[PDB]
Amino acid sequence: IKPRIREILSKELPEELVKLLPKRWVRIGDVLLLPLPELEPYKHRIAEVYAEVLGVKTVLRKGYELLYGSDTVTVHVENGIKYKLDVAKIMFSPANVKERVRMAKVAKPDELVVDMFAGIGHLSLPIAVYGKAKVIAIEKDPYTFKFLVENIHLNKVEDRMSAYNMDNRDFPGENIADRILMGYVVRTHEFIPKALSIAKDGAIIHYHNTVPEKLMPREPFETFKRITKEYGYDVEKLNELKIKRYAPGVWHVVLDLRVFKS
């Protein structure tokens, strides 16, 4: 359908700009995230034809800026999982699909999983649905929490998945988790002491973080290990995966770690 768009726009666009039309886009549910600056004078006209041919209700600009339509709430379906969200307000990357598919395959059904940064259920919904485990999901932001709650119902896991709207440091659970999800990328090490308190002896922690290239592969395991030992714990690294690289040269990585007392 890439030709069909150009065909419609080559009859109103400057002819030299037709070669400059986005050849890629991010589609989340029924909502489109369209990248482009020289196309600015036609952004609304442009988004309107992408929506007509693609069959979406709304289009936002990445650079979120409304370009076509009004409704930014949608349900994205991925690996059988329903993720309702406000696209304009809540971060979700269809590009991180591999890690949510991985989460679908990790847990056993007798596990208790604690998701410390649940969002709308990004990493914990595949666990509740496919892995069948019990899950406690903590999300601090009230608006994001409403979608988390709605997604628990949409995915039919209200019997095994509990959500709380609070800061993860006020979560009073101690020594209870078989598995912890730390899917936050901003100086995630600051939350390690709380993770260790929530964890049972032998628990697996999926620790996300952002790391400068130059410090790899030493970091971020070296910092995690040093903090863990300071608090009187030990840690074994089972796996490390890179998820995505960002300018200038920083990586979103996930580490699968096993923690032990004494």
Query: Domains of the chain (ranges plus CATH)?
Result: 1-70 (3.30.300.110), 71-262 (3.40.50.150)
Q: What is the largest CA-CA distance in the chain?
A: 72
Tokens standing for residue 212: 């400068």
Amino acid identity, position 139: E
| Dist CA 107 CA 116 (whole Å) | 16
Is 168 known as a binding-site position?
Answer: yes
Q: Give the strands of the sheet with 134-138, arranged side by side.
A: 161-164, 134-138, 112-115, 177-182, 199-212, 250-260, 234-246
Name residues whose C-beta falls within 8 Å of residue 197's C-beta, 6 or more positions apart in sequence: 174, 175
> What's the reported resolution, in angstroms, to a tenth?
2.1
Q: In b/e form, how buried is each residue of 85-112, taking b as 16+ CB within 10 angstroms?
A: bbbeebebeeebeebbebbbebbeeebb
Contact predicate 112/160, CB 8 Å: no
Contact predicate 228/188, CB 8 Å: no
DSSP structural state of residue 56:
-
**What stretches of 155-233 show up as alpha helix (H) in DSSP?**
192-198, 221-230
| Dist CA 121 CA 125 (whole Å) | 5
Of residues 137, 130, 48, 147, the one with CA closest to residue 90: 147
Of residues 116, 111, 142, 150, the one with CA closest to residue 128: 111
| Dist CA 32 CA 62 (whole Å) | 10
In the numeric block, the tokens 């090490």 are attached to 189
Q: How many CB atoms lie within 10 A of CB 167?
A: 11
| Dist CA 135 CA 115 (whole Å) | 7
The burial of 43, by beta-carbon neighbours within 10 Å (0-12 exposed, 13-18 middle, 19 or more buried), is given as middle
Is 93 known as a binding-site position?
Answer: yes
Contact predicate 148/162, CB 8 Å: no
